Enzyme design. Structure first.
Site, short mmCIF file in Angstrom:
data_model
loop_
_atom_site.label_atom_id
_atom_site.label_comp_id
_atom_site.label_asym_id
_atom_site.label_seq_id
_atom_site.Cartn_x
_atom_site.Cartn_y
_atom_site.Cartn_z
N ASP A 61 88.88 90.68 37.53
CA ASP A 61 87.74 89.93 37.01
C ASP A 61 86.45 90.71 37.28
O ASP A 61 86.33 91.40 38.29
CB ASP A 61 87.66 88.54 37.64
CG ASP A 61 86.94 87.54 36.76
OD1 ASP A 61 87.08 87.64 35.52
OD2 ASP A 61 86.24 86.67 37.29
N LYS A 74 92.73 91.13 -8.01
CA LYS A 74 93.40 90.88 -6.74
C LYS A 74 93.15 89.45 -6.26
O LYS A 74 94.08 88.75 -5.84
CB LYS A 74 92.93 91.88 -5.69
CG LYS A 74 93.75 93.16 -5.61
CD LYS A 74 93.10 94.15 -4.66
CE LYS A 74 94.12 95.09 -4.05
NZ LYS A 74 93.48 96.04 -3.10
N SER A 126 99.74 97.26 -1.96
CA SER A 126 100.50 96.15 -2.54
C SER A 126 101.57 95.63 -1.58
O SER A 126 102.75 95.51 -1.92
CB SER A 126 101.12 96.56 -3.88
OG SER A 126 100.13 97.09 -4.75
N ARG A 160 89.45 95.56 -10.57
CA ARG A 160 90.73 95.45 -9.88
C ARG A 160 90.65 94.50 -8.69
O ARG A 160 91.62 93.79 -8.40
CB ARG A 160 91.22 96.83 -9.46
CG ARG A 160 92.59 96.86 -8.82
CD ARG A 160 93.01 98.29 -8.49
NE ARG A 160 94.35 98.35 -7.91
CZ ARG A 160 94.62 98.27 -6.62
NH1 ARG A 160 93.66 98.14 -5.72
NH2 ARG A 160 95.88 98.34 -6.21
N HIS A 202 74.96 73.49 -11.61
CA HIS A 202 75.42 74.27 -10.48
C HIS A 202 76.45 75.28 -11.00
O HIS A 202 76.98 75.11 -12.11
CB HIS A 202 76.01 73.32 -9.43
CG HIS A 202 76.38 73.97 -8.13
ND1 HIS A 202 77.60 74.56 -7.91
CD2 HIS A 202 75.67 74.12 -6.98
CE1 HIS A 202 77.64 75.04 -6.68
NE2 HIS A 202 76.48 74.79 -6.10
N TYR A 232 96.27 86.73 -5.94
CA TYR A 232 96.59 86.16 -4.64
C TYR A 232 96.35 84.65 -4.63
O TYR A 232 97.19 83.89 -4.12
CB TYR A 232 95.80 86.88 -3.55
CG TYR A 232 96.40 88.22 -3.17
CD1 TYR A 232 97.77 88.35 -2.93
CD2 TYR A 232 95.62 89.37 -3.11
CE1 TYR A 232 98.33 89.58 -2.61
CE2 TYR A 232 96.18 90.60 -2.79
CZ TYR A 232 97.53 90.70 -2.54
OH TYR A 232 98.11 91.91 -2.22
N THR A 290 95.23 84.54 15.59
CA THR A 290 95.53 83.59 14.52
C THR A 290 96.94 83.06 14.72
O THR A 290 97.73 83.60 15.51
CB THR A 290 95.41 84.24 13.13
OG1 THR A 290 96.58 85.01 12.84
CG2 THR A 290 94.16 85.12 13.02
N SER A 327 80.78 95.61 6.49
CA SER A 327 80.68 95.77 5.05
C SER A 327 80.70 97.24 4.66
O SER A 327 80.23 98.11 5.41
CB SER A 327 79.40 95.12 4.53
OG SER A 327 78.32 96.04 4.55
N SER A 352 100.70 75.71 4.42
CA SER A 352 100.45 76.63 5.53
C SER A 352 101.70 77.38 5.94
O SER A 352 101.63 78.55 6.34
CB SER A 352 99.88 75.86 6.72
OG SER A 352 100.80 74.88 7.15
N1 LIG Z 1 91.29 87.10 -1.80
C1 LIG Z 1 92.44 87.51 -0.89
N2 LIG Z 1 93.18 86.42 -0.84
C2 LIG Z 1 94.34 86.38 -0.11
N3 LIG Z 1 94.71 87.48 0.57
C3 LIG Z 1 93.97 88.62 0.54
C4 LIG Z 1 92.84 88.65 -0.18
N4 LIG Z 1 92.31 89.87 -0.04
C5 LIG Z 1 93.09 90.58 0.75
N5 LIG Z 1 94.12 89.80 1.11
C6 LIG Z 1 95.35 89.93 1.96
C7 LIG Z 1 96.53 90.32 1.04
C8 LIG Z 1 96.48 91.85 1.03
O1 LIG Z 1 97.82 92.47 0.80
C9 LIG Z 1 96.07 92.17 2.25
C10 LIG Z 1 95.31 93.49 2.26
O2 LIG Z 1 94.12 93.43 1.53
P1 LIG Z 1 94.04 94.53 0.27
O3 LIG Z 1 93.99 95.93 0.85
O4 LIG Z 1 92.79 94.34 -0.61
O5 LIG Z 1 95.46 94.34 -0.61
P2 LIG Z 1 96.41 95.65 -1.10
O6 LIG Z 1 97.31 96.10 0.04
O7 LIG Z 1 97.32 95.29 -2.29
O8 LIG Z 1 95.34 96.88 -1.52
P3 LIG Z 1 95.73 98.29 -2.28
O9 LIG Z 1 97.00 98.07 -3.07
O10 LIG Z 1 94.63 98.70 -3.21
O11 LIG Z 1 95.96 99.39 -1.26
O12 LIG Z 1 95.20 90.94 2.79
MG LIG Z 2 95.84 97.31 1.02
#
Ligand SMILES: Nc1ncnc2c1ncn2[C@H]1C[C@H](O)[C@@H](COP(=O)(O)OP(=O)(O)OP(=O)(O)O)O1
Ligand SMILES: [Mg+2]
Ligand SMILES: *P(=O)(O)OC[C@@H]1CC[C@H](n2cc(C)c(=O)[nH]c2=O)O1
Length: 1010
Positions: free
Chosen positions: A137, A715, A662, A711, A522, A719, A618, A632, A818
């Site tokens: 600690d 995504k 993917s 793209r 809105h 998703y 989580t 960012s 969930s």
């Molecule tokens: N809007 C979203 N909603 C739900 N899950 C998400 C979202 N964005 C990202 N994720 C989750 C699923 C993704 O497989 C994972 C990694 O994020 P991301 O890198 O953008 O996907 P990806 O692995 O298919 O990218 P890439 O194919 O371009 O390398 O986190």
């Molecule tokens: Mg990825």
DNA sequence: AGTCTGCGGCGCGCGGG
DNA sequence: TCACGACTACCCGCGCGCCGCAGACT
DNA sequence: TCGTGA
């Protein structure tokens, strides 16, 4: 001649002969073929209906190169032995920990350094504790400096105390705690141990450490759960807690325990709540104010009390860990999880000091200078309106000016004399008084996002003045004759209450009401209220004629507060980072290579940052850190968005990185295709394996080109569809993507897309409810089938689920979705653990100079010297192919497609940026950055000196001694529950595309049953 | 005893990943 | 005729409006 | 926590 490609009945290519022999050994089963004829008829029918049968696929020459030999007959045995080898000593230390506790010394001696107290003997001064396991600690005086002040530790047979030189004397407050981490293997246990790890002296090396820091919080996060869901699971805990606090008496029967039994099991994350839950121990927290004091003299008194309080925290943490650890071992029994946790615990970031300071100064100065000017501009116009009480007709005529309230507050007299007390201002406008929060304030306090400034700058919608109402935020008056026309334009009519109320304000002045109010839309069309006009997503309506500005200043007030949102969000966290320069501690910055080889040249500036990462934060066992994982990317118009660029490598070193592509979609396609036993059995699997990212023919790119969006937008769309959404919601997202589309058109597109994607549904008494006639019906039905199981486990490694989400705990307020999300996200975590374990084993075996730097979910990066740069990429590719082969082997398929086996590109760079060919120019940074490189597999193979060196025999000898035990895969016990004729009939009904056929098949099963 | 007159915790919008 | 049944998921922190209270002069 | 179809 050349080798012949291997193709299954669908147009999908497999691995070559050499790779098949080296990875899968020799495996061939005609039993899959034996029933395959029936399965193939059903699969053929689906693929013929959607239109995918006979389409062209990519064909590439076979790849064959030698690979390091496996340590087992199968992948499971090899991973078991490697996982035991990586985690053996620490796992032995964590078990057989002391149960009884050593008593405390009566008096503590204030002297600098480490002092050892053993009962029955005199205290002894020591250099190090030098023990296998301790509980640790740290306390700091945070308003003065970031460096520690005192620490204590408890071991099996002694007590240890460390006191800083600052409190004893002198005026230099920079010191760190030594622990001999480099030369001795040890385990240190502690709550929120990432804070404690940044204080240890031996951590500030580039060389790898030999100590394992274990966090009790992450273990409580992973097992026994917590109220992670903000509203569903946390608010309930809060309301029962306030009910217990308010009413002291407890009735015999709880009012709502039957509805929500799970309420009892869950607990909060803070160590006091964990202690009172598990061990029924109460801890007071009063001493935290003493360490807020800005005087070192106050620390001299109350020394005994502070030391005793810290020792009490140590004792509580130990007794909490004793209860938590065995249950975590029971839930997750595979060694790979433990090894992956050990790998994720340690991280480091190198940087420079003066660069950091320059970055902070530039961003802060630009932000303040931008803000001041627009605030002054708005104050100046408010002053004139403040004097315009006289000649009331002038503001009376103007509708915006008429909307302002021009009443005044009279003056008070006490005993016929003015109190002059509790009076804001004498006889000034009531609207102007509200601006001042206090009497003493001299100038009005006005800021963007204030509700009144859309009145100060006049603004109009469709060349109509705006009017505020109680129920609806902003409304524009529309004449009666055009009301249906505005109904044709899809503008929504105002509520009846507001329409009744507006009559009085219209008929006052003698003015007349010839129109009805219409609500300003809105972003969301239905049941949403507009509040602020200068917010984002109102920019498209702006300058299109939908929203008209009589004031050009609004445009400037839109550019400002849009170039400076991110810095406003993150300035606190960023400015409070802890950096340690090299000049303070000269002897501690040691190179990764064993041979220094000189050439230091007295590097002027170096610095090291220790990120504070909770490994499991989580329900899905993901990691959390507040600044770096939520940082960012660089943007052209956002001030101070180049944060990740500040990380630099020291001379002679580089960053080698990779990213998984993917991931979750591939896992979903695999778990869909498992039943057919052939890759590409489902249509969505074929639409996942159709091409590669490099050629531009991936699924997400196709979705983007059909929908005409980027793209990333595709995504988000995909998703959201996969986890469960609505057609109205998807049409809303299409409205965000393109503002020029009529709502009916977006609704039509969404309905047709969802009708093709999901298909129809049917309810039968024997077969419950199932989907049919869709491309992804089987994927769904399998997901709901596995979500309903009594004891759900992760398919790859058999990890159990948390106590809170179990269906036995919940009899009302069920949360089905969930579970679906959890299974896939957890599988992603298992993928990461396997990658880390394989990379660690290869690095240790071939004596490469490498150490993990950062790992942001899929993204992984390493710090590698100049000589070994390509060898790390080769090791990364081997790790990826092993992980993918293990995933395919667990589901029951003994083959792997060639296209998805390897990473697309592996990148080599000097700084942390998303793409190597990025200038990364911001308003603060005006200097370009030289480019790195990215390599695919063939460009990696043809380069020289990219091959691994000679191995070591002793490592294999140490691996060979561990034992292996056979375990049955998780899907086999699921499948043995169901009888085969029920299975064939259920699948045969799931393939039909019309309801009458399904009814006939159900009746046919009833006739066969007899 | 009345008469106002601030004031910090709670909750919702709004951006970053 | 009722029985589902809905619904992207996992995280972070800041600014402004509202309310049930504390406190200085009649 | 009201809404909805086959
Ligand atoms: N809007 C979203 N909603 C739900 N899950 C998400 C979202 N964005 C990202 N994720 C989750 C699923 C993704 O497989 C994972 C990694 O994020 P991301 O890198 O953008 O996907 P990806 O692995 O298919 O990218 P890439 O194919 O371009 O390398 O986190
Ligand atoms: Mg990825
Ligand atoms: P950032 O680099 O943009 O994201 C890194 C990882 C990828 C996955 C996770 N994540 C990001 C975002 C933006 C999201 O909405 N949901 C996620 O899970 O963070």
């Amino acid at each position: 001649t050349a080798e012949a490609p291997r193709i299954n009945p669908v147009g999908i290519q497999y691995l070559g002969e050499s790779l098949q022999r080296q990875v899968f050994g020799s495996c061939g089963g005609k039993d899959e073929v034996e029933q395959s004829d029936k399965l193939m008829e059903l699969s053929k029918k689906s693929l013929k209906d959607h239109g995918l049968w006979g389409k062209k696929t990519l064909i590439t020459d076979p790849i064959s190169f030698p690979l390091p030999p496996l340590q087992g007959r199968s992948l499971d045995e090899h991973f078991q032995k490697i996982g035991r080898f990586n985690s053996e000593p620490y796992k032995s230390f964590c078990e057989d920990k002391f149960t009884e506790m050593v008593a405390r010394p009566a008096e503590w001696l204030r002297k600098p350094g480490w002092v050892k107290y053993v009962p029955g003997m005199a205290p002894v001064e020591v250099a190090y504790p030098d023990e296998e396991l301790v509980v640790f600690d740290v306390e700091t005086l945070y308003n003065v400096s970031d460096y520690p002040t005192l620490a204590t530790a408890l071991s099996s047979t002694a007590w240890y105390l460390w006191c800083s030189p600052f409190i004893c004397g002198g005026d230099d407050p920079a010191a760190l705690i030594p622990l001999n981490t480099l030369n001795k293997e040890q385990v240190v246990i502690g709550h929120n141990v990432a804070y404690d790890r940044a204080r240890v002296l031996e951590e500030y090396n580039f060389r790898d450490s030999k100590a394992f820091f274990l966090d009790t919080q992450s273990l409580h996060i992973a097992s026994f759960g917590l109220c992670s869901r903000q509203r569903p699971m946390f608010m309930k805990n809060n309301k029962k807690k306030e009910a217990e606090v308010e009413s002291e008496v407890h009735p015999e029967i709880s009012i709502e325990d039957y509805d929500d039994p799970w309420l009892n099991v869950s607990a909060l994350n803070s160590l006091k709540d964990v202690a009172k839950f598990h061990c029924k121990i109460d801890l007071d927290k009063t001493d935290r104010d003493f360490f807020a004091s800005t005087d070192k003299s106050t620390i001299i008194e109350n020394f005994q009390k502070l030391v005793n309080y810290c020792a009490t925290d140590v004792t509580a943490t130990s007794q909490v860990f004793d209860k938590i650890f065995p249950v975590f071992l029971k839930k997750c029994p595979h060694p790979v999880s433990f090894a992956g946790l050990k790998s994720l615990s340690k991280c480091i970031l190198p940087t420079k000091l003066n660069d950091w300071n320059d970055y902070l100064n530039s961003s802060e100065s630009l932000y303040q200078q931008s803000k001041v000017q627009i605030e002054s501009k708005i104050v100046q116009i408010i002053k004139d309106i403040a004097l315009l009480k006289d000649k009331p007709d002038f503001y009376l005529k103007d509708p915006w000016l008429s909307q302002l309230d021009w009443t005044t507050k009279p003056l008070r007299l006490t005993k016929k004399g003015v109190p002059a007390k509790c009076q804001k201002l004498p006889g000034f406008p009531e609207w102007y008084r509200q601006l001042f929060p206090s009497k003493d304030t001299v100038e009005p306090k006005i800021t963007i996002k204030s509700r009144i400034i859309p009145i100060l700058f006049k603004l109009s919608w469709e060349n109509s003045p705006v009017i505020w109402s109680k129920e609806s935020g902003w409304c524009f008056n529309v004449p009666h004759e055009q009301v249906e026309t505005y109904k044709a334009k899809n503008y929504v009519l105002a509520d009846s209450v507001s329409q009744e109320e507006e009559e009085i304000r219209m008929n006052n002045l003698g003015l007349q009401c010839t129109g009805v109010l219409f609500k300003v839309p809105h972003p969301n069309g239905p049941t949403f209220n507009c509040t602020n006009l200068l917010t984002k997503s109102y920019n498209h309506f702006f300058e299109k004629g939908v929203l008209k500005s009589e004031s050009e200043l609004a445009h400037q007030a839109l550019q400002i507060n849009s170039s400076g949102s991110y810095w406003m969000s993150a300035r606190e966290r960023i400015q409070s980072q802890f950096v340690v320069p090299n000049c303070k501690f000269p002897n501690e910055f040691q190179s990764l290579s064993a041979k220094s080889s000189l050439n230091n040249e007295k590097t002027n500036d170096l610095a090291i940052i220790i990120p504070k990462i909770v490994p499991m934060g989580t329900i899905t066992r993901r990691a959390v850190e507040n600044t770096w994982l939520t940082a960012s990317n660089a943007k052209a118009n956002r001030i101070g968005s180049e944060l990740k660029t500040q990380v630099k490598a020291p001379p002679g070193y580089c960053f080698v990185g990779a990213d998984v592509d993917s991931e979750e979609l591939w896992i979903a396609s695999l778990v869909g295709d498992s039943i057919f036993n052939v890759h590409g059995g489902t249509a969505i699997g074929w639409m996942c394996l159709e091409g590669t990212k490099n050629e531009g023919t991936d699924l997400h790119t196709k979705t983007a080109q059909i929908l005409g969006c980027s793209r990333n937008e595709a995504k988000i769309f995909n998703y959201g569809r996969i986890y469960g959404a609505g057609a109205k919601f998807a049409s809303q997202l299409l409205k965000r993507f393109n503002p020029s589309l009529t709502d009916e058109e977006t609704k039509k597109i969404a309905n047709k897309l969802y009708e093709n994607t999901k298909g129809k549904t049917k309810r039968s008494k024997l077969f419950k409810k199932f989907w049919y006639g869709g491309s992804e019906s089987i994927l769904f039905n399998k997901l709901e089938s596995i979500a309903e199981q009594e004891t759900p486990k992760t398919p790859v490694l058999g990890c159990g689920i948390t106590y809170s989400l179990m269906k036995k705990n919940l009899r009302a307020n069920s949360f089905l979705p969930s579970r679906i999300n959890w299974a896939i996200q957890s599988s992603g975590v298992d993928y990461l653990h396997l990658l880390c374990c394989s990379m660690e084993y290869i690095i240790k075996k071939y004596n490469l100079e490498a150490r993990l730097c950062i790992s942001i979910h899929d993204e992984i990066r390493f710090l590698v010297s100049e000589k070994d740069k390509y060898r790390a990429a080769m090791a990364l590719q081997i790790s990826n192919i092993w992980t993918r082969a293990m995933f395919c082997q667990q589901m029951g398929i003994n083959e792997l497609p060639q296209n998805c086996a390897f990473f697309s590109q592996v990148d080599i760079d000097s700084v942390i940026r998303k793409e190597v060919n990025m200038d990364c120019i911001t308003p603060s940074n005006k200097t370009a950055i030289p480019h790195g490189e990215a390599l695919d597999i063939n460009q990696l193979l043809d380069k020289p000196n990219s091959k691994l060196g000679k191995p070591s025999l002793d490592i294999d000898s140490k691996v060979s001694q561990y034992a292996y035990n056979y375990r049955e895969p998780v899907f086999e016990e699921y499948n043995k529950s169901y009888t085969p004729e029920f299975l064939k009939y259920f699948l045969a009904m799931q393939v039909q595309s019309d309801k009458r056929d399904v009814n006939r098949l159900e009746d046919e099963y009833l006739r066969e049953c007899t």
